[PDB]
Design a binder for this molecule. Structure first.
Ligand code: HEM
Ligand SMILES: C[As](C)(=O)[O-]
Ligand SMILES: C[As](C)(=O)[O-]
Length: 406
């Protein structure tokens, strides 16, 4: 019945069958679907018999604590169940302190705040270019027409790769995270590595100032980073910034299309866009992965067994009423916007700075040119749930005569 037999160490009163890949009432919205785990009668920590059987921390306090305690909660394979990530081998996902430290520092060198600030004007140009091409059309499939092209073009800029390589590169990343049956994950991954390796070896000899050159010439354990290590980190620097951004932007634009008050608020108070970005990140949080118990451990009165998998939904912390008043409501003026949208602990998103800049630039440049838009008449928006939840399709409409080319 898709149900995994309840392990002896798990008390029956903590059972709550939740399917993270197809939650009940997903039609009400994915965040709302996950919020069922936070209804009054549900414990802070539960066990679901779906997807092979695993724990699920449902409150921000437990989620933050588990992510900080890497000694008890390992990131060896954050995919639950393990088969959900197949041949995944990106760095530094599966590493924990100390091994993890060196790789994070090198990655922070290429996508950290200083780099983001230097790339802002170009990111702004890319955004304006995409929005302006859509403006006169009076409609668009947001996810395909803006959300997807934006992040991949940003990567080419960051990695110093030619625009002409997008069709191939984007096809491969889509084959990996949004498979259509053409290639297996392993095959798509190998093809991605076949693309990266030559560029890495080349820039290892004649380096530039791009992200790949810096990574290729990095130092690990007092010795040059290997071709294997470099490609495995570059692969995540690429894939980690695509679907998360694509879907987050889609959730945010869906909300704005349905709320004229919030659009009007940002048009009249542009200086609030950064704050609005943070509140949208909280309300439309979308990632949910986990950790593995390194040893038998008592956590908040619950006995966890070595090897057990525990889902620690990054999405749930900010939706927790114990963290934020009326969590399902959007308030750009919230004084304390508590969330773990980019994660928490040692694995906190390395691209958080780049992500925030992409969101802020998108909101400013879109609201400046297309201030009044709505969901296409007759359309019904559907969400999808998983490790990175999202929007299937987002058809938008507007009157071109009400827009302004800037
Ligand atoms: C709204 C957009 C984004 C969200 C919500 C997001 C979320 C996350 C989360 C929750 C984690 C931690 C996962 C865990 O602890 O297992 C993570 C890790 C990571 N993300 Fe992001 N991400 C976003 C954008 C980006 C971008 C733009 C990049 C690429 C430039 C990126 C690169 C990475 C990398 C490399 C890691 C690995 C960190 C590590 O394992 O130490 N992310 N992301
Ligand atoms: C066992 As369930 C996917 O309900
Ligand atoms: C899907 As894992 C072994 O990383």
């Amino acid at each position: 019945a898709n149900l995994a037999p309840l392990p002896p160490h798990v008390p029956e009163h903590l059972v709550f069958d939740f399917d993270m890949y197809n939650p009940s009432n997903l039609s009400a919205g994915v965040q709302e679907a996950w919020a069922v785990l936070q209804e009054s009668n549900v414990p802070d920590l539960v066990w679901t018999r779906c997807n092979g059987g695993h724990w699920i921390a449902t409150r921000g306090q437990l989620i933050r604590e588990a992510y900080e305690d890497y000694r008890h909660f390992s990131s060896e394979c954050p995919f639950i169940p393990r088969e959900a990530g197949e041949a995944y081998d990106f760095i530094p996902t599966s590493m924990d302190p100390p091994e993890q430290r060196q790789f994070r520092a090198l990655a922070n060198q290429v996508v950290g705040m200083p780099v983001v600030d230097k790339l802002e004007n170009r990111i702004q140009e890319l955004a304006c270019s995409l929005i302006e091409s859509l403006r006169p059309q009076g409609q668009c499939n947001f996810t395909e027409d803006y959300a997807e092209p934006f992040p991949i073009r940003i990567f080419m800029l960051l990695a110093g790769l030619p625009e002409e390589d997008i069709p191939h590169l984007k096809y491969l990343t889509d084959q990996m995270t949004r498979p259509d049956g053409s290639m297996t994950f392993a095959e798509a991954k190998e093809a991605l590595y076949d693309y990266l390796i030559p560029i890495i070896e080349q820039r290892r000899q004649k380096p530039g100032t791009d992200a790949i050159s810096i990574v290729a010439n990095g130092q690990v354990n007092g010795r040059p980073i290997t071709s294997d290590e470099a490609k495995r980190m570059c692969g995540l620097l690429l894939v980690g910034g695509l679907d998360t951004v694509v879907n987050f932007l889609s959730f945010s634009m869906e909300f704005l299309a349905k709320s004229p008050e919030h659009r009007q608020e940002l048009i009249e108070r542009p200086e609030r866009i950064p704050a609005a970005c943070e509140e949208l990140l909280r309300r439309f949080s979308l990632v949910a992965d986990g950790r593995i118990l390194t040893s038998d451990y008592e956590f908040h009165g619950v006995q966890l067994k070595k090897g057990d998998q525990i889902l620690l939904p990054q999405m749930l912390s900010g939706l927790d009423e114990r963290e934020n008043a009326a969590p399902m409501h959007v308030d750009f003026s919230r004084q304390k916007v508590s969330h773990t949208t980019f994660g928490h602990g040692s694995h906190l998103c390395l691209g958080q700075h780049l992500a925030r800049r992409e969101i802020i630039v998108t909101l400013k440049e879109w609201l400046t040119r297309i201030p009044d838009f709505s969901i296409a008449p007759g359309a019904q928006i559907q969400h999808k749930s998983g490790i990175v939840s999202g929007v299937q399709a987002l058809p938008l409409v507007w009157d071109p005569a009400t827009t302004k080319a800037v």
